[PDB]
């Protein structure tokens with residue numbers, strides 16, 4: 181007989197409990213021994229809150245089986261009372277069941293265990309080996325003999341998640357969705373200096389202690405979408421790295437449309453003729469980014485997008501995490517060149533978009549993603565040259581200071597809105613601009629598109645998050 185071990189505590193990064201192994205009592209029975217005390221069954225079935233006929237039928241229909249479960253996960257008290265009845269053939273196992281003290285606030289990130297206390301979703305699965313420990317062994321007849329192997333308890337795990345920032349993102353996402361009539365969305369917050377995921381919240385959500393498939397989707401890691409205008413900063417990074425474009429260089433986007441063979445690119449804001457590179461992001465001109473893309477070639481844009489991880493495996497090993505797709509056409513005709521440049525030529529997740537913005541914010545160095553508390557930060561990879569990244573940072577700062585609704589009072593912030601397709605309203609950005617600390621992606625699944633919807637969410641979550649992290653105001 182196996183001796184189940186104590187499963188490791190999961191906490192947030194500051195030690196708040198997120199998943200707790202609490203001792204329970206499980207009752208199993210040997211049917212044939214139970215068959216010799218049938219007069220005891222009704223009171224046993226009563227004590228278990230079980231129907232007498234259902235109970236009696238399960239014993240008899242599993243007659244020659246010598247092992248069946250009567251009930252699992254009783255309180256130590258409830259289990260004590262049953263065992264006190266001294267019913268022949270009724271035996272107890274001291275087990276552990278998981279309880280989730282933060283419930284729906286962090287459901288998808290934490291995940292949960294199965295009936296056997298084995299990780300089945302989220303962190304519980306991803307880190308199951310760390311958390312599980314090793315069962316002990318117990319030899320029996322009927323008579324109990326020896327504990328021939330001890331259970332070794334699982335190990336504690338502190339997530340990267342900051343429950344304070346997680347609750348703020350949860351509250352603000354839920355309010356943004358209700359205000360917009362939206363039914364689904366996600367919000368990711370990442371530490372750009374450490375790679376840590378500080379908050380990862382989805383809607384709808386569920387209480388893991390108490391089901392609908394929409395509620396179980398860890399959307400930040402599995403909802404894949406074309407990121408649209410939110411990847412124009414990486415097209416611009418390619419343009420600045422090509423050697424052919426200064427930030428003050430000009431593109432004529434008049435009249436806000438561009439015909440490529442048969443398709444017509446149409447800008448959302450068509451009151452522009454000459455725009456500099458910052459102006460192309462401020463106006464979010466698909467025409468401007470296309471014309472720049474034609475000049476530098478799609479290879480250089482693909483290459484930046486690949487390097488910052490869009491459409492690439494995040495490496496987290498999180499279960500069910502999706503990768504999206506960044507097609508490598510090798511040579512791109514005009515239409516595919518433009519389409520990649522303004523973000524409809526690829527598919528990404530919110531985690532990926534946030535990681536990509538984190539590398540941009542961290543002066544072009546990508547720090548590896550982590551879902552667990554990072555005490556020793558691994559060396560990052562320089563994926564965009566520091567000069568280009570710092571230049572794109574400044575451009576994105578001007579985008580916010582002018583999408584005025586994204587301004588973060590007390591701080592210089594940077595970011596870019598977009599409309600995703602699969603429509604979703606998006607904002608990706610980071611703050612403070614002078615020494616970036618956190619990056620954020622907001623995804624709102626729309627039933628009044630784009631920047632007008634997602635930017636106030638960014639503003640409010642960033643305002644709260646920077647203050648929760650005691651970031652000194654830089655404005």
Ligand SMILES: *C(=O)N1C[C@H](NOS(=O)(=O)O)CC[C@H]1C#N
Pocket residue numbers: 407408409410447448463464465466596597598599600629630631
């Ligand atoms: C980006 O995703 N774009 C370009 C344009 N402006 O985007 S925004 O939502 O105003 O910031 C319109 C939507 C989408 C396209 N095409």
